[PDB]
Design a protein around this ligand. Structure first.
Ligand SMILES: *[C@@H]1O[C@H](CO)[C@@H](O[C@@H]2O[C@H](CO)[C@@H](O[C@@H]3O[C@H](CO[C@H]4O[C@H](CO[C@H]5O[C@H](CO)[C@@H](O)[C@H](O)[C@@H]5O[C@H]5O[C@H](CO)[C@@H](O)[C@H](O)[C@@H]5O)[C@@H](O)[C@H](O[C@H]5O[C@H](CO)[C@@H](O)[C@H](O)[C@@H]5O[C@H]5O[C@H](CO)[C@@H](O)[C@H](O)[C@@H]5O)[C@@H]4O)[C@@H](O)[C@H](O[C@H]4O[C@H](CO)[C@@H](O)[C@H](O)[C@@H]4O[C@H]4O[C@H](CO)[C@@H](O)[C@H](O)[C@@H]4O[C@H]4O[C@H](CO)[C@@H](O)[C@H](O)[C@@H]4O)[C@@H]3O)[C@H](O)[C@H]2NC(C)=O)[C@H](O)[C@H]1NC(C)=O
Ligand SMILES: *[C@@H]1O[C@H](CO)[C@@H](O[C@@H]2O[C@H](CO)[C@@H](O[C@@H]3O[C@H](CO[C@H]4O[C@H](CO[C@H]5O[C@H](CO)[C@@H](O)[C@H](O)[C@@H]5O[C@H]5O[C@H](CO)[C@@H](O)[C@H](O)[C@@H]5O)[C@@H](O)[C@H](O)[C@@H]4O)[C@@H](O)[C@H](O[C@H]4O[C@H](CO)[C@@H](O)[C@H](O)[C@@H]4O[C@H]4O[C@H](CO)[C@@H](O)[C@H](O)[C@@H]4O)[C@@H]3O)[C@H](O)[C@H]2NC(C)=O)[C@H](O)[C@H]1NC(C)=O
Ligand code: NA
Lengths: 913, 913
């Protein structure tokens, strides 16, 4: 009596529009833009001005229709279900011409009993799914005077208005780094399940919660306590009374084989738990903190009398604790010298760590075409930059299991969020009920992933949208604050706590922490909000100061506990532009390039050249103020070269912020995180990304890689006081010692006399997760530099130590390269360094040599036909010094000839015709 | 009392669509596609699948509206005219809200008296021109059962149907090498003319006819007779009775200053003539036949009593006779050994010459954007290929004066045609009246150009469309034949003869000649048609055999008097593709590349993949049968390389035809012309062009240049009999002597023993415009080639002689390079020739060297940022031999760095991964 399953992917689909005049072959899973492009009705959606030209698609219905489905049993002993892991979004499902369901949530698994439709069916049943125009439906919802309305500043759009009314990925209606395609379709897998009486059940969803005994959300657990493994299984259809549960936990070697205890059951769910000795399971750690130990847990449900299980579920899991700590700074912390206020940090298995990484946005406007290969390449680039965390930004979406799997096994912590973002939302009973379906399904679905690090209720509420709402409508503000608490704390925190003991919570991405957490309270998390004291420090920080005159001025950076967002936009490579835009449109300010800059966004549906131009201007001023301004005679080389200068400014600014945040680990703030805005791009356009749509590295990720190294030497320049400081900062969990060499040369590479009055070398000791000051110098009073525009300081650090939980006693050697230029890059008197470049096919290394003088911001550019990244880039090179640079080849289309097309350049080349 | 003129270009224009929802800035002259693209409403019309996607434009009206026009006098002593040199096509002209005209001919100058509209105007007048949707209007015309209809095979479309009903450039509705944009707008210049009573007149158009006294159309004039200069001037408005005319003719040094005699006048025209001694004017000749002597003739019209002229007109003219000879082969010609029948050749100033060139199609789908620079570059490429003639193909259009000017001064003969093409046409009274406006205006306008070489009534009537009509509807055929004669002979020949004594005529582009020409006959040209005799030869030839198994088989080529059309399609360069199509679409058979191949055309409005694919297949089979078939690992290099093989096949086939046509000059046919199909491209697509849209040379023009040299040595291979013949052919007007070296080597460059049994060198004598056989050899019986797949024969000719009408006694040296391969290129055992390439900035030469062996089809490719052509390309190179190759730089965008981006390759490179 096994469950009979027809995968909807193997069925045959046709897609039709609303007006009866467009019919093309369909795919499942897909969305209509993708099936239209596949048939040649449209060009690649990311191209040209398609954000405008393709709006006829979002404005109408699309229907996915199967051919008659064969092979279903028509015996009435049998229950026939439709199971949909994702439908995007408002849809009308029909089976043999009967409306069987009307789904309205992208983020929910839907299931419908079609037994009776099948029975009435005079031939093989056709399944059809009629997907609405989302703008039209949300416009119709909003137009009613019977629903909630908010001030214009609170619901101000990017492109389409009214997004707060639909449980759909919010960026689908446009964002300040992406287009507004509002795609629809069967966006995740789906199938038909036929279940026979007294037979096998079907598994819908499985919540595995591995926690320390006594553990609660948001509180540090007892690391000496036994593990509790709790398993709760959702299913279709009939589980008999007095059901029993057993589990086998094996190395992903049996850890445990046993029965579960305290079994409970209801109509569609069965739950049990088991306790395991603290000494048995090996711990999961993030990358560079130990092993990524995982286990397979298979859970079987049997029924009194039955020889064999009728429900079996398997997940891959880890044994670890991950705490997000946002409560008060303790007396103990205060006496240690930490500024009072509220924490904002993470702990893994009881250990504090410095978080290093970025914000992950959706890699594509069409989730169905996002591949395993594409996401594996992206994770390679994340590891290589020395990340241990991504913030999975809201709102794109809840990531599919397969993406958390990648994180799990590589050791990247995923700070996760519910899909609510940069606006205020409804809190009627029906909207909430829909949200609760969503929060309950996804919290349960995702809970077993070792990479999952926290849940936050949504993006930018207490730090941005709530105070906008207070300002915009003071009289109604306490009402909208109550809805916030009611939805994001009372409903949502209770839902998470009901389904997880292991994952901590915050009602939004940035806030001043909590005063109390207690489920006995009507609002179980009592937020601090603005109940603050002068001198105290709370919360994580943002930094988006676009005034280019203070960009490198550390007195303008925020003093906080964790930096979860910060950035400036930059152009992508010309090779990236070349993917999406016409050759004649390749200039800094062409109409198409400007219209693709959504910084700043249109605020609606117009072609807003003015707002886009504001971003164009920010980049232009940044370059003009700090970097040589290209003036290349070939207009193509001029565009390419201007694109690269914008990237240099972004890299250097992020470096400047990251080293300041990291040093803060050892100052009274005790800063413990850096997540730059933003890791990646959704299309080809000027943004905050470090990784372009296809994966190509900007200058940023090469610089952040170095600046995210375990042990770094960092140069801090107070340019008003003309004072230089060099600090050494380490994220290791034990003290380390080492040395930094400090070599002053002119831009031809000749040493400056007496090393400009500075020591050639100095030793250091630095505490665990801490910093130490090793040099201070007034450039005019204490150093003797004959010409500051003909000077560079080359900094090399070496240190010895162990990574956390290292097995081997053999100590690792840590090295960091850096430089300090006592003027702005545009003031440096660089000359042609006469770079030589060659490739060695045996060693697979490029050799780069400066022959005539010092090269600044040396830069290798791989060609179009290849994907990957170099082991270093944007570096200082002195003549005679030979540098070897390898490349991680992820994909090659050039049959190996790409090595001959690689080029090298430096700052000098920005200045030539 | 001077004429007051407002140029409509300096007025301010707005363009609006039919439905009130599109408004953009306008230009005059322009067309709506161009003004829409300029405003960013659409992308470049030539891009992607815009032939489909842009059809919403042709389907509706576009209105060009001025701002209120200032500065017109409102005195009723004054006549105010609108003068339009071209409006495309059906339009409604309004002036101060009054319909003043409804033009319906692209090819006519329209003028309208708006004096009364101006007088009623309560403020400054607005001029508006509402342009129709042409498809809609011709569909409406055709739908009426009151108009003529033809069999489907006769009016079979390319894309839009019904084109026979509109006097508009026929290719605007699509052709088998171009798109169907059906553009509309003020496509040529226009202005407002205010004329005061008793003042200056305004010149509309001026017919200058310089002929030999007694000369008539189509008959060889007397070269010893005096020149008659006839000047007929069209004007607005009032010329008083008893007007007089004088002329000054000056070097373009007075040739003549005098009065005109036999003056006649009517309402809008004044005419007079003057006779000049045969000894006074220096003659105009085509390029490489003498000087391009031109003169300025200024004609003034004065009135009894008036001190100064009231009408002045200036044209640039030449003194020469050009005969198109299509009458019977004379007894004299027969006794000389020429096959009987009818001639088809040209004579310049009484001398026969061999015509060499190609068919010129419109360079752009939008005539307004065609520039002087663009057409100058095209004429450079024409001269460089050794052309002396272009056939200005119908139907595109009647060329503007400025293009004939370029031809005039460079010496390129322009065989010109009336705009009727590849279908049969109406012959109602209104249609004819419209045509007569057209033929009369353009014949008069163009007559003074020395480059003008003939008028033919239209393309493909008697050789194609008439026999299709006889086959398709035998009963109605005599009726449609009568309309043909009535329109294209009775009406049109009379109209030309009324306005020109100097320019010969043919009722269509290809026919068997005439039996009689006599204006006393009801049909003044009595066509031979099919009144033929076995063994006799008539007419010019076409050749479009697409069966690749006979392409190089000279027994399949047509034996005629002149070859006016012949070809095979080939892909353009990848750099050309890259202009118009997405990167992902760059493969031989992508959907976009296939859809842009209009060989074969859709036959209507569908996306006809099947018909397009037939052309794709022709090119594929051609390559597979004869040339190495690329299999490059990089898909981009694979596409590029497949594009180049198609070009090699086209070049070699044209060479094979041209040398066969030219040799025919000395055989009983006495062949006297080669015009290959086609010179140039209207957009980026696989076609018969030798010059791609932007001007880039295919392989074809490099090969035809050599094959159009004055003196050539040509290899004829009968591959069934395995016989080689080498002939020397000369187009000079006097005998020449010289020598040809014949060097047999293997593909490493080592001589074959005893030169394979062939003489190393041989002398020749060749008659004026004639040929001589210098070698015959059976490859197996008479030669000793150890391995025919490891053999090449390198042929170099040198000769001494004079070009026609050369002043200097110093004789010119003529050299021609060629080769013979005794197997097909795909059978040749080529090895890596190890080519070296360098550039010398002082000499501006590239040096090309084969280091390791013989290189076949050596090929330099200039990069994207530069326009021009090399002085040689696609050549055989033997090792040690150094070849220098210069480049005519027409435009550079790369600031001189393009020389470093030039690459070289050979046949060998098609075969590598
Ligand atoms: C392992 O794990 C698990 C998980 O997995 C766990 O379990 C858990 O637990 C928790 C705790 O307790 C809980 O929670 C809770 O909940 C509730 C509700 O409930 C309900 O619902 C639910 C849900 O459902 C859903 O889902 C599911 C799953 O999947 C399924 O099954 C179903 O079907 C459904 O589904 C649906 O829906 C959804 C949405 O929702 C969607 O998604 C889907 O699709 C569909 O549609 C459930 O679950 C439940 O259940 C249960 O119950 C029943 C009876 O009733 C049974 O039958 C069953 O079997 C079960 O049982 C279990 O549980 C229970 C409890 O509940 C117990 O008793 C038993 O024993 C067993 O175990 C139902 O149906 C809610 O309501 C709650 O809340 C409350 O509480 C809290 C604490 O806890 C607090 O805080 C809050 O606030 C509240 O309270 C309040 O109210 C109340 C009344 O209502 C009262 O009493 C109190 O007092 C209070 O009040 C107060 O205060 C206020 C203010 O503050 C004032 O005003 C007033 O006046 C006063 O004063 C909670 O949350 C859950 O539920 C569970 N789950 C399960 C599955 O089971 C376990 O535990 C673990 N283990 C270890 C060892 O650890
Ligand atoms: C384009 O796509 C869209 C989306 O797919 C299509 O719109 C959808 O059309 C279907 C079929 O008509 C509807 O389902 C049927 O609903 C009726 C009830 O009708 C009322 O309810 C609707 C309310 O819609 C909501 O959205 C509106 C905006 O459009 C908004 O203004 C309104 O306030 C509602 O919004 C609230 O609720 C939303 C959740 O629904 C929520 O997200 C919002 O936030 C908000 O809170 C109105 O459109 C309509 O005018 C009426 O007011 C119902 O009677 C039908 O019931 C049948 O099916 C169910 C199972 O689903 C079954 O239990 C019943 O017994 C019954 O079955 C029997 O009848 C069938 C035939 O009717 C028969 O086939 C069957 O065999 C049985 O015999 C059904 O549920 C969707 O509600 C609607 N969705 C929308 C609007 O979002 C649209 O038609 C497409 N257009 C084209 C041209 O193709
Ligand atoms: Na209010």
């Amino acid at each position: 009596g096994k469950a009979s399953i027809h995968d909807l992917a193997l069925q045959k689909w046709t897609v039709t529009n609303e007006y009866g005049n467009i019919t093309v072959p369909g795919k499942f899973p897909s969305q209509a833009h993708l099936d239209l492009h596949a048939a040649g009705v449209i060009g690649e959606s990311n191209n040209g001005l398609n954000d405008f030209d393709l709006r006829w698609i979002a404005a109408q219905n699309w229907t996915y229709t199967s051919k008659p489905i064969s092979g279903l049993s028509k015996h009435s002993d049998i229950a026939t279900w439709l199971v949909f892991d994702g439908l995007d979004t408002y849809a009308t499902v029909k089976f043999c011409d009967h409306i069987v369901g009307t789904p309205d949530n992208q983020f929910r698994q839907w299931f419908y009993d079609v037994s009776s439709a099948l029975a009435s069916c005079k031939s093989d049943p056709v399944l059809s799914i009629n997907f609405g125009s989302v703008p039209r439906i949300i416009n119709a919802i909003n137009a009613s005077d019977e629903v909630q309305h908010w001030p214009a500043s609170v619901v101000y759009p990017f492109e389409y208005p009214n997004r707060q009314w639909v449980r759909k990925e919010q960026n689908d209606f446009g964002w300040d780094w992406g287009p507004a395609f509002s795609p629809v379709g069967p966006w995740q897998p789906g199938r038909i399940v036929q279940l026979s009486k007294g037979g096998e059940l079907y598994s819908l969803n499985t919540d595995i919660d591995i926690f320390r005994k006594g553990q609660f959300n948001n509180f540090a657990p007892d690391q000496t306590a036994p593990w509790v493994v709790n398993a709760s299984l959702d299913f279709l259809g009939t589980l008999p009374k007095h059901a029993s549960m057993s589990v086998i936990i094996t190395d992903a070697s049996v850890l445990y084989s046993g029965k579960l205890e305290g079994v409970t059951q209801s109509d569609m769910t069965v739950t049990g738990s088991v306790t395991i000795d603290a000494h048995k399971p090996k711990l999961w750690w993030p990358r560079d903190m130990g092993n990524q130990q995982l286990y397979n847990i298979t859970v079987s449900v049997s029924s009194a009398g039955s020889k064999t299980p009728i429900l079996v579920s398997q997940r891959r899991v880890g044994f670890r604790t991950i705490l997000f700590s946002s409560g008060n700074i303790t007396d103990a912390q205060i006496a240690s010298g930490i500024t009072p206020g509220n924490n904002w940090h993470f702990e893994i298995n009881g250990h504090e760590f410095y978080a290093k990484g970025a914000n992950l946005i959706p890699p594509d406007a069409f989730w169905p075409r996002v591949t395993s290969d594409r996401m594996n390449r992206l994770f390679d680039s994340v590891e290589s930059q020395n990340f241990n965390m991504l913030r999975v930004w809201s709102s794109g979406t809840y990531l599919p299991d397969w993406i958390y799997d990648i994180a799990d096994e590589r050791g990247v912590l995923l700070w996760s969020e519910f899909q609510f973002s940069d606006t205020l939302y409804p809190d009627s009973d029906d909207f909430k009920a829909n949200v609760v379906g969503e929060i309950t399904y996804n919290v349960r679905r995702l809970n077993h992933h070792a990479s999952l690090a926290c849940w936050m209720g949504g993006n930018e509420f207490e730090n941005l949208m709530l105070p906008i709402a207070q300002g915009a409508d003071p009289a109604t503000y306490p009402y909208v604050l109550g809805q916030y608490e009611n939805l994001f704390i009372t409903t949502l925190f209770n839902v998470l706590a009901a389904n997880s003991h292991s994952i901590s919570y915050s009602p939004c991405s940035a806030n001043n922490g909590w005063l109390e957490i207690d489920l006995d309270l009507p609002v179980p998390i009592v937020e601090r909000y603005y109940n603050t004291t002068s001198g105290h420090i709370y919360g994580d920080t943002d930094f988006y100061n676009y005034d280019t005159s203070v960009s490198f001025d550390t007195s303008a950076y925020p003093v906080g506990r964790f930096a979860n967002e910060f950035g400036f936009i930059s152009m992508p490579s010309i090779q990236t532009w070349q993917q999406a835009v016409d050759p004649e449109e390749l200039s800094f300010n062409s109409t198409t390039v400007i219209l693709r800059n959504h910084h700043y966004p249109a605020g609606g549906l117009t072609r807003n050249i003015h707002n886009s131009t504001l971003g164009q201007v920010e980049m232009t001023l940044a370059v003009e103020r700090y970097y040589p301004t290209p003036d290349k005679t070939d207009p193509v080389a001029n565009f390419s070269s201007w694109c690269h200068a914008t990237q240099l400014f972004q890299a250097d600014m992020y470096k400047s912020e990251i080293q300041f945040y990291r040093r803060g680990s050892g100052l009274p703030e005790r800063q413990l995180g850096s997540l730059y805005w933003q890791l990646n791009d959704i299309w080809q356009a000027p943004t905050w990304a470090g990784l372009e749509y296809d994966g190509r590295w900007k200058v940023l990720p090469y610089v952040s890689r170095r600046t995210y190294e375990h042990v770094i030497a960092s140069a801090f320049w107070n340019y008003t006081a003309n004072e230089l400081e060099i600090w050494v900062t380490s994220d290791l969990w034990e003290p380390v010692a080492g040395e930094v060499s400090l070599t002053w040369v002119d831009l031809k590479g000749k040493p400056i006399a007496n090393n400009a009055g500075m020591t050639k070398s100095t030793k250091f000791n630095v505490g665990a997760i801490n910093t130490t000051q090793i040099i201070t110098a007034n450039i005019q009073s204490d150093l003797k530099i004959p010409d500051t525009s003909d000077a560079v300081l080359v900094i090399e650090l070496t240190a010895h130590g162990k990574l956390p939980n290292a097995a081997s006693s053999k100590t690792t050697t840590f090295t960091h390269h850096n430089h300090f230029l006592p003027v702005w890059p545009n003031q440096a008197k660089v000359s042609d360094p006469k770079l030589h470049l060659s490739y060695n096919k045996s060693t697979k290394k490029f050799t780069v040599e400066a022959t005539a003088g010092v090269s600044l911001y040396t830069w290798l550019t791989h060609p179009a036909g290849v994907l990957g990244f170099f082991d270093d880039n944007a570096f200082v090179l002195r003549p005679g010094e030979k540098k070897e640079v390898g490349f991680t080849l992820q994909q090659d289309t050039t049959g190996g000839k790409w090595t001959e097309q690689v080029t090298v350049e430096s700052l000098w080349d920005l200045t030539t015709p």
